[PDB]
């Protein structure tokens, strides 16, 4: 009772903002703290997550004008409970269809506890079940977040709606996310991609590390996917993925366009840099009307290989370009110490790729 | 005694993790706080270093799965005592030969107090006596660390062993460090190099500042040295 | 631990003199409080006995210049333990042969627990 009075005083001081523990969070790796998070987040104050493993029985929904900061990766840890069912990302903005604004997230771990579902499992449909999903949002800063044991993706930026839209080439989906910054984040043990963007624009991804997917499909470190545009990636690292940085679209979607890679290091990926537009590669297909403008510089590729068997034993590449118009590559170093890992083509420019330039290789 | 009870409550709240002051650290520029650091670090909790100058009579050894964060450069300051002898880096991973994993260090100053030895002095042998030495480690993040008055280097990433191996051209030394990130760090007043790498791979050095060595030999801001490979340096400054 | 700090302050106030509970007396009808009584009585302060049944395993010896006051009859109760043997009064002056002086005793029950025999 004395300690409770002391705690009350500390909490009133609001040295970090409001602590989730003020609203009843235990952070003991066992107790369901979801209500404390919801209460703290609805209070209007910046929210602080101190040391602990904070168990949650459902997704943490973020309204507009949210500040959520933790004590740091592997210090403040947020985690799905073993008993959580299917359908929700661990953390995502409240308004799934038309979005939210001004969300600032920093310094904690998101553990999606994919383990709880058994092994070999990925997202149940569309953009559902990432560790962090941002849909139709404006002005989002994501810093120093570690995303582990993820069902779908680690961090996904997408347009409004739970599903990904397939509106055809040369279209722009409604409700993009816009003005997004992802910095010093790590993604690992994901089912699809570590850090990925869809149908959204004005995004900087800086100094992040995406590595070691759980699964063996099109599992990429950084996937700049359907509908993306106006994105800069700089000084990130990918390791042990299929694609290091993939820039593309699926068929029936517009390819990512006007993308800048300002330095990247790809370690033991299959295709370190893989730019493509499915449905627009065949000689007898229509040229992509959207696959245009990639400027990529100071690219490092190390020991590309397919020891893990990604994508039905697709052959390794330092660089693979297809479909795209206007790809400018400057300063590329590919290095291996094992001649048997990559045996077909080190760098390919094929499959309707056009007006491409390679310098300083 | 009342204040002690209040402090006890605060400490149980663990707002940052565990404070070194909880384990008896004074941070008064005089008292030897090494035991508090060792106790905090062995507790299994993330460790926090608040405002103060925390004096240490021997090197701070880091085990695997360590989180050590301070209140910031020139706020949380860790410093060798005047009476410290020769042979140790100020901070380094526990297992010197085969290494450690998952070490996350942020937001403090390391003052190697090289001054205490007289002027003109550098490391006693091999990789000994840097402000921070990482040997044979995997997954190390070093952020917002200021390294000053350093005997050997400010920050050194190397393979296992206290000495640097000389195995000949075209070789790969055993026990590399691997997956290392050094960001927003500053190194100054060092005897050899500010930030340096040896026999290690997959390293990003970003936005750091290495300047003004004490000595006048092969004293480099950033030295990517013997056995290094697969390193990116970006947006750093040397002076 | 907080309550202990509060108690420490109260005890320093010495509103009655010194309480036997300050020296470790329980007054719970079970615990042997003889040492607390002896300590309090040797301290030189007037001694106060608050509410309780204070069990004693031997006679309470009174030196000269003693003030011993209780919360009242059937409130402060002093009692021999069941296991006490033979030979002692429950309360008596220390110097049995040539005596003591200035002893002021007020407001408590003495239960000699003769039943035990
Ligand atoms: Co993918
Ligand atoms: Co996608
Ligand atoms: Co040098
Ligand atoms: Co060197």
* Interface contact B46-A50, CB threshold 8 A: no
Give ∠ CA B12-B17-B19 in degrees, rounded to 5: 75
Question: Based on C-alpha coordinates, what's the Rg of chain B?
Answer: 17
Chain A: residue whose CA lies nearest to C1: A2
A5–chain C nearest CA distance, Å: 11
Which residues of C are less than 8 Å from B1 in CB distance? Answer: 5
Give ∠ CA A70-A75-A79 in degrees, rounded to 5: 80
Nearest to A193 by CA among A169, A166, A224: A224
A219 CA to middle of ligand 2, Å?
A: 10
Chain A: residue whose CA lies nearest to C5: A2
3-state SS string over chain A?
A: CHHHHHHHHHHHHCCCCEEHHHHCCCCEEEEECHHHHHHHHHCCCCEEECCEEEEECCCEEECCCEEEEECCCCCEEEEECCCCCCCCCCEEECCCCCCCEEEEEEEEEEECCHHHHCCCCCCCCCCCCCCEEEECCEEEEEEEEEEECCCCCCEEEECCCCCCCCCCCCCCCCCCCEEEEEECCEEECCCCCCEEECCCEEEEEECCEEECCCCCCCCCCEEECCCCEEEEEEEEEEECCCEEEEEEECCCCCCCEEEEEEEEEEECCCEEEEEEECCCCCCCCCCCCCCEEEEEEEEEEECCCCCCCHHHHCCCEEEEEECCEEEEEEEEEEECCCCCCCCCCCEEEECCCEEEEEECC
Chains that touch A (3 or more CB pairs under 8 A): B, C
A222 CA to middle of ligand 2, Å?
A: 10
* Interface contact A10-B10, CB threshold 8 A: yes
Beta bridge partners of A168: none
| Phi, psi at A87, each rounded to 5° | 120, -15
Residues 6+ apart with CB under 8 A from C107: C69, C70, C71, C72, C73, C75, C76
Chain C: residue whose CA lies nearest to B5: C2
Beta bridge partners of B10: none
For chain B, what is the largest distance between any 2 Cα atoms, rounded to a whole number of angstroms?
A: 66
Alpha carbons A10 and A20: distance in angstroms, whole number: 13
Alpha carbons A141 and A132: distance in angstroms, whole number: 12
| Phi, psi at A183, each rounded to 5° | -140, 135
* Interface contact B1-C5, CB threshold 8 A: yes
Location of structure tokens 């390791």: A239
A303 CA to middle of ligand 3, Å?
A: 29
**What does DSSP say about strands B47-49 and C60-62: parallel, antiparallel, or unpaired?**
unpaired
Is A153 among the annotated ligand-binding positions? no
| Phi, psi at A85, each rounded to 5° | -80, -155
Which residues of C are less than 8 Å from B5 in CB distance? Answer: 1-2, 5
Specify the 3-state DSSP secondary structure of C72.
Answer: coil
Q: Are C81 and C55 in contact (CB under 8 A)?
A: yes
Chain C: which residues have CB within 8 Å of chain B?
A: 1-2, 5
Distance of CA B178 to the CA centre of its chain: 17
Residue B9 has its nearest CB partner, among A7, A237, A335, at A7
Which residues of A are less than 8 Å from B230 in CB distance? Answer: 265, 267, 300, 302, 335
Is B198 among the annotated ligand-binding positions? yes
Structure tokens at B198: 């040896």
Is A198 among the annotated ligand-binding positions? yes
Alpha carbons B147 and B30: distance in angstroms, whole number: 20
B238 CA to middle of ligand 4, Å?
A: 17
* Interface contact B2-C5, CB threshold 8 A: yes
Q: Are A33 and A71 in contact (CB under 8 A)?
A: no
C43–chain B nearest CA distance, Å: 25
C55–chain B nearest CA distance, Å: 32
Distances in Å between the alpha carbon of A313 and those of A266, A268, A277, A310? 19, 14, 20, 6
B200–chain A nearest CA distance, Å: 14
Structure tokens at C105: 């005793």
Q: What is the resolution of this structure in A?
A: 2.1
Nearest to A213 by CA among A196, A191, A197, A195: A191
Ligand number nearest CA of B127 is 4
Distance of CA A201 to the CA centre of its chain: 14
Which residues of C are less than 8 Å from A3 in CB distance? Answer: 2
Alpha carbons A354 and A268: distance in angstroms, whole number: 28
| Phi, psi at A309, each rounded to 5° | 80, 25
Alpha carbons A78 and A49: distance in angstroms, whole number: 9
What domains can be seen in chain A, in order of their start residue?
1-361 (2.160.20.10)
Which residues of B are less than 8 Å from A184 in CB distance? Answer: 183
Chain A: which residues have CB within 8 Å of chain B?
A: 2-3, 6-7, 10, 15-16, 19, 21, 50-52, 71-75, 184, 207, 209, 234-235, 237, 239, 263, 265, 267, 300, 302, 335
Location of structure tokens 């008064």: B28
Distance of CA B140 to the CA centre of its chain: 11
Question: Technique behind this structure?
Answer: X-ray
3-state SS string over chain B?
A: CHHHHHHHHHHHHCCCCEEHHHHCCCCEEEEECHHHHHHHHHCCCCEEECCEEEEECCCEEECCCEEEEECCCCCEEEEECCCCCCCCCCEEECCCCCCCEEEEEEEEEEECCHHHHCCCCCCCCCCCCCCEEEECCEEEEEEEEEEECCCCCCEEEECCCCCCCCCCCCCCCCCCCEEEEEECCEEECCCCCCEEECCCEEEEEECCEEECCCCCCCCCCEEECCCCEEEEEECCEEC
């Amino acid at each position: 009772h004395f300690a409770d009075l002391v705690i009350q005083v500390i909490d009133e001081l609001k040295q970090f903002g409001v602590s989730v523990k003020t609203y009843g969070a235990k952070g003991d790796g066992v107790t369901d703290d979801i209500r404390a998070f919801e209460k703290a987040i609805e209070s209007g104050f910046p929210v602080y997550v101190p040391y602990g493993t904070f168990m949650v029985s459902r997704g943490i929904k973020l309204p507009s004008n949210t500040v959520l900061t933790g004590a740091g990766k592997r210090n403040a840890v947020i985690r799905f409970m073993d008993s959580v069912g299917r359908g929700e990302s661990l953390m995502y903005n409240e308004n799934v269809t038309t979005g939210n604004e001004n969300i600032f997230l920093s310094s904690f771990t998101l553990d999606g506890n994919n383990k709880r579902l058994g092994q070999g499992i990925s997202g149940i449909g569309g953009s559902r079940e990432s560790n962090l999903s941002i849909r139709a949002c404006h002005n989002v800063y994501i810093r120093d977040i570690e995303a582990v044991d993820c069902t779908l993706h680690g961090i996904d930026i997408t347009c409004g709606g739970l599903d990904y839209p397939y509106l055809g080439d040369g279209t722009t989906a409604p409700n993009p996310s816009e003005n997004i910054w992802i910095e010093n984040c790590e993604a690992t043990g994901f089912g699809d991609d570590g850090i990925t963007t869809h149908h959204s624009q004005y995004i900087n991804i800086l100094n992040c590390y995406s590595h070691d997917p759980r699964l063996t499909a099109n599992c990429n470190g950084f996937e700049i996917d359907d509908g993306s545009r106006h994105v800069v990636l700089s000084n990130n690292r990918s390791k042990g993925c299929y694609g290091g940085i993939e820039i593309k679209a699926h068929g029936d979607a517009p390819a990512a366009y006007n993308i800048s890679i300002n330095g990247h290091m790809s370690v033991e990926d299959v295709r370190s840099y893989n730019f493509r537009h499915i449905g627009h590669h065949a000689a007898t297909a229509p040229q992509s009307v959207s696959a245009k403008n990639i400027v990529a510089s100071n690219l490092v590729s190390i020991r590309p290989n397919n020891k893990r068997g990604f994508q039905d034993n697709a052959t390794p590449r330092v660089l693979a370009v297809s479909a795209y118009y206007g790809v400018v590559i400057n300063g590329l170093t590919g290095y291996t110490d094992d001649p048997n890992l990559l045996t077909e083509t080190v760098v390919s420019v094929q499959f309707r790729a056009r007006n491409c330039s390679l310098n300083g290789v």
